[PDB]
Amino acid sequence: SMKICSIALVGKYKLRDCYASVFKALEHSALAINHKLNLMYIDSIDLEKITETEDPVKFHEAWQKLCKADGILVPGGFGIRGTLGKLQAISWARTKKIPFLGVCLGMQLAVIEFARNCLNLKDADSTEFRPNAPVPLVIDMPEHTMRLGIRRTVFKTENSILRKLYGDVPFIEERHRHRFEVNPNLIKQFEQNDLSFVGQDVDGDRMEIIELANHPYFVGVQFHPEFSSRPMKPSPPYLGLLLAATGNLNAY
């Protein structure tokens, strides 16, 4: 039999059909390192204060799942829905050193959470949700419509866990679906703190990969890396998650 790795998926639901690629990419990585995947699904809303007040049994069910997780994933579903609970899950993974991966909106929320609790900009927000937000950290930046199809992402440095997992290539190609980006006006406030923008679009206007220093594996990604995962080449961001979740990251 096989050793179990438990991953918490913090989204909208059990397995529903739109998580199909995410599941497959997680399976390839688990099988690759010889573990049975135990995917625990959390409805983001269940982690929030509101649910403690109104449905405490559910709240504690959700928090027990998050707390026993070897690794944590915030996939790139869309919506204002359960945004608050996703932020709670990201703080947990950050402060408690749990391996973490944020895809698309997941990356954007990790950026916000970091500004809020490590850079102390308490009102940092996304204009997707409050269009008039006083501290517009995440903004509407469309290609003059949405950034779509297979696109290039270029590494900005050689000290990067994702670069290494991707085989030391100076650039990668993945599938995109996003128009809300990190605000270039606020990038400077991140210097000499632990969160780095490690990846960029070709134009250099969009931050698309983030990594956190002094954490075993805390990775954010703007594109959807599931869409090129395969059994003999697991999507590297997902493979990193599983490697870290089982303590095998160095060895590889």
UniProtKB/Swiss-Prot annotation:
Glutamine amidotransferase type-1 domain: residues covered: 6-252
Catalytic residues, chain numbering: C104 (for gatase activity), H224 (for gatase activity), E226 (for gatase activity)
Positions of transmembrane segments: none
Superkingdom of the source species: Eukaryota
Family, similarity comment: Belongs to the CTP synthase family.
Its biological purpose: Catalyzes the ATP-dependent amination of UTP to CTP with either L-glutamine or ammonia as the source of nitrogen. Constitutes the rate-limiting enzyme in the synthesis of cytosine nucleotides.
Protein name: CTP synthase 2
Origin organism lineage: Eukaryota, Metazoa, Chordata, Craniata, Vertebrata
